[PDB]
Write a protein that binds this DNA or RNA. Structure first.
Ligand code: MG
Ligand code: MG
Ligand code: MG
Ligand code: MG
Ligand code: MG
Ligand code: MG
Lengths: 367, 367
DNA sequence: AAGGGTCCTAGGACCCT
DNA sequence: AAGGGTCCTAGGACCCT
């Protein structure tokens, strides 16, 4: 019943990918740029005051020597992301992706199999790889402690393999569920790992300062929670369930209140191949024409190449737009005539366009 | 590439189920009642003027000796329905259900395998079972005609097996796709079958008188179509594609216009086990209390028994209501604590109720 | 005051760089 | 003027008795 979960989180992912391909960006403060936004930066630039999602203005003031490369084309980040998930899938096949740079793996089976190869005495010699959260003391007679320490050893092998085979560093957290694995992986955050023993779980959740730091509690849920006076993890833990249901719904209230205790029974899901392919472009009110069709060709061309490479065939297309002041969209199936190309696809999309600062196209429903 | 599809349509299904269980209703005009509505009747009662979906008032005027049994509890109809689909699944495993009394089967593989067991001469002796639509002449040298005639023989075996093994009669239509199979199965409608040869396809679609007779064109789409002056199959066939897209959407316009030509490339889908379980009750404004919770207990009890029997476990529940003058609903996941009961389920539903002539409960998301 | 089914759509919540 | 992802929800279209 008890699970050993690992969460793997790569260091400054986009920046790290760039530093690998142009080694002259090591040691130099590096920011990866997307339009007006420095979406991430390496640790050189972080020391200098640069931070993630910071206007390229504010950033090059804090670090005028900041080197900036353009990371709008996600292609290379996307491709490394899958090399990581595939490498982890070798350890155990059930790997759950979260964004491009995070993976969950359920090591429970792996941990148990390794423990069965051990023998009475060497059980006394199981050691931890990496940090133990809250410098908590290990009890080798606690079977849960032994399993999490074995988890931590698998985690160090994963991280070692990632570096040996892909040149990537990252952090890992080992805990009894996904929430806790993900919260603990970030405790020692540059290329290190941390294991959470059960006795320190409450210390972990109460170390957070705003309830939005809980994965699953986001921008809107946080704002609602404040409006009820809920600001700390303990506030949410102790707040009326009944009121929380009425004011948020029985699904949301129940789960986030569970999360507030560090409880999370969600299984690690095999993400497998993606469920969708999309390309976006944004622009400061730079489209007011039905000659926004030029923008939709490039988005298609990239998607069309990405589809051909995946091999599967999509059966639904969607067009998303953002009107200047909250997005609108229209989708429809992809004629079977097509599924087996530029010209017909553009016609569908422009009809979809006409039925309606950003344009996006998405292929989903892949077979 | 060419398909041989069969569509199977049981005769006066509910009524037929009732006549089997109480044989004294044979020969007597029988109507199956649901609230104020005679939802179907046997052919005795049809001769006498009784028709489907007719108020029990109008019906017992046309046939005061009309016997009425109550068919609100679908349990027995549902159970026979699956005995039919399972019987057909023996012929070929890919059977698509449509409602409780219709099934599609792709006989293409079966037809081809039987033709390979034949030998030059006996090919000259392939005959049709049942009607040929439009009394069209068979050409034994036309491979498409030979395959559809073999289809018709499989169809007669299916219908014979249905009667021998379940006591049920019905109609079958054999054609090159689902649209045409379903349209042709009803041509000779009491316990008979009909095969559609390709040359008569246009005669079949133009035999219809209102475009709503096309499966896929329903109440709303028909009303829209009229408002554009489209009233006949030929009107829809010849009407501007462009206008039809703008006025209905690129998905709907394109498919229904294809249907108007008798074209339908949709595959026969293996329906397999149901995707949802639901129970409804209606009442003439007979609920104005939070003591509509009594109505939700019975709906649950029936669903709960149905779930236990299926074996799988649902992960979503929905509550549907109809406010007296167009339905509203609320769903939420089913706590994992529960998935492994009356009391907690009722509490969820009444919360769902309170966030909001008919009450319904649905379990979906089965695993 | 039928009693069920199917799948699609547009939007919104969450997650990451 | 980021550029992507995931899944859930409420409603609506269709089909049948
Ligand atoms: Mg990360
Ligand atoms: Mg990271
Ligand atoms: Mg959060
Ligand atoms: Mg029928
Ligand atoms: Mg019927
Ligand atoms: Mg119709």
């Amino acid at each position: 019943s008890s699970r050993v979960i690992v969460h793997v989180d790569l260091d400054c992912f986009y920046a790290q990918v760039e530093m690998i391909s142009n080694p002259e960006l090591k040691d130099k403060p590096l920011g990866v740029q997307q339009k007006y936004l420095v979406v991430t930066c390496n640790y050189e630039a972080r020391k200098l005051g640069v931070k993630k999602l910071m206007n390229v203005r504010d950033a090059k003031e804090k670090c005028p020597q900041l080197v900036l490369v353009n990371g709008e084309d996600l292609t290379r980040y996307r491709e490394m992301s899958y090399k990581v998930t595939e490498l982890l899938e070798e350890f155990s096949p059930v790997v759950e992706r979260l964004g491009f740079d995070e993976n969950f793996v359920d090591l429970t089976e792996m941990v148990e199999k390794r423990l069965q190869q051990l023998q009475s005495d060497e059980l006394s010699a199981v050691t931890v790889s990496g940090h133990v959260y809250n410098n908590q003391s290990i009890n080798l007679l606690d079977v849960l402690h032994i399993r999490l320490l074995v988890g931590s050893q698998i985690a160090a092998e994963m991280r070692e393999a990632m570096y040996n085979q892909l040149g990537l560093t990252g952090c890992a957290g080992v805990a009894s569920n996904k929430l806790l694995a993900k919260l603990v992986s970030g405790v020692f955050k540059p290329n290190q790992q941390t294991v959470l023993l059960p006795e320190s779980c409450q210390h972990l959740i109460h170390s957070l300062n705003h309830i939005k730091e809980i994965p699953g509690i986001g921008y809107k849920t946080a704002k609602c929670l404040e409006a009820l006076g809920i600001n700390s993890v303990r506030d949410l833990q102790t707040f009326s369930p009944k009121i929380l249901e009425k004011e948020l719904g029985i699904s949301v209230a129940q789960r986030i209140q569970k999360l507030s205790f560090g409880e999370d029974n969600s299984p690690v899901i095999l993400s497998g191949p993606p469920q969708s392919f999309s390309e976006e472009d944004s622009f400061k009110k730079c489209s007011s024409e039905v000659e926004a069709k030029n923008k939709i060709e490039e988005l298609l061309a990239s998607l069309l190449n990405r589809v051909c490479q995946d091999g599967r065939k999509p059966h639904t297309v969607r067009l998303i737009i953002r009107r200047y002041s909250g997005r609108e969209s229209r989708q429809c199936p992809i004629p079977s005539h097509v599924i087996q190309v530029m010209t017909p696809m553009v016609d569908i999309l422009m009809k979809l366009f006409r039925n309606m600062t950003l344009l996006s196209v998405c292929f989903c429903n892949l077979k």
